[PDB]
Structure 1
Amino acid sequence: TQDTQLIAVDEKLDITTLTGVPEEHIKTRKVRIFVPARNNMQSGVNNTKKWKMEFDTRERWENPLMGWSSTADPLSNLVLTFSTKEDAVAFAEKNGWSFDVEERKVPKPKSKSYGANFSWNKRTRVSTK
């Protein structure tokens, strides 16, 4: 139905040599994927709804001039977004970075009722509003 001289190719993609990443950056660097935990200073939620990948932090020395934050690894302030973790891990393997996986932690739904603020015998009765 889509005849274009199709060929079964079982082994996974090795686009590594195509990407141009240097050997030690494609080998030594370890990237982890995760859902970023929300800033506890905020109650907003729509920042833990994506799968972001980031790389291990490297040396950060202070230059002699003003004590700036000169670094050497270019892939330090590089974070990639992904809808589902499967896409992220596929990208990681096909690129060739050693990857680490953390499962999407989500808040457990707790039973909440205002009638618990008052009680006849339960300890849950509040003492101030």
Structure 2
Amino acid sequence: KLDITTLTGVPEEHIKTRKVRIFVPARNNMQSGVNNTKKWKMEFDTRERWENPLMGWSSTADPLSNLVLTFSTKEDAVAFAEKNGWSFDVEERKVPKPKSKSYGANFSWNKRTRVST
């Protein structure tokens, strides 16, 4: 029942009207590396972005647009969200299921796994 909301100084609109997403970032499918999928991340909900009339740069009014936090475990992120009074959605970690790989299978005598090239 810890509540730091009064002490944080965050204005009430972002405390109440923002949904924070707790998740482990998925691997960038362009790369096979997995080092960026080992820590939980807290990200706020996306808001409106509009073009500046003068230059066309994207302007925002969301202070927490770029705020992202790293947490070792899901429970730590949940506790931080609760202590800060942010509504939170938790996406369970997705792990690659174990696979059975056999280089011999590429030359099966009767199975369809034989590779044409």
Q: TM-score range by the shorter chain?
A: over 0.9
Tell me the residue number matched to 1:52: 41
| Higher gyration radius (CA) | 1
Cα separation, 2, equivalents of 1:51 and 1:119 = 42
SS of match in other structure, 2:56:
coil
How far has the Cα of 1:66 moved from its partner? 1.0
Q: Deviations over 1:9-66 (max 9, x none)?
A: xxx1011100000000100010010010011110001000000000110010001011
User: Which structure has the higher relative contact order (CA within 8 Å, separation 6+)?
Assistant: 2
Once residues 123 and 45 of structure 1 are traced to their aligned partners in structure 2, the CA distance between those partners, rounded to angstroms, is 31
- Describe the SS at the equivalent of 2:21: strand
Larger fraction in helix: 2
Deviation at 1:113, TM superposition (A): 0.7
Secondary structure at 1:52's aligned position in 2?
strand
Structure 2 length-normalised TM: 0.99
Q: Secondary structure of 1:53's partner?
A: strand
Structure 1 CA distance for aligned equivalents of residues 99 and 62 of structure 2:
44
Q: CA separation in 1, counterparts of 2:68 and 2:116? A: 47
Residue 80 (structure 2) aligned to one of 76, 83, 91 = 91
Alignment of 1:1-129 (within 5 A): 12-128=1-117
| SS at structure 2 position matched to 1:77 | coil
Q: Deviations over 1:68-95 (max 9, x none)?
A: 0110011010100000000000000010
Q: CA shift at 1:116, angstroms?
A: 0.7
Equivalent pairs, count: 117
Q: Cα RMSD (Å) of the superposition?
A: 0.5
Output the CA distance in 2 between the equivalents of 1:102 and 1:81.
15
User: Structure 2 unaligned runs (5+)?
Assistant: none
TM normalised by structure 1 equals 0.90
Unaligned runs of 5+ in 1: 1-11
In 2, Cα distance between the equivalents of 1:37 and 1:101?
14
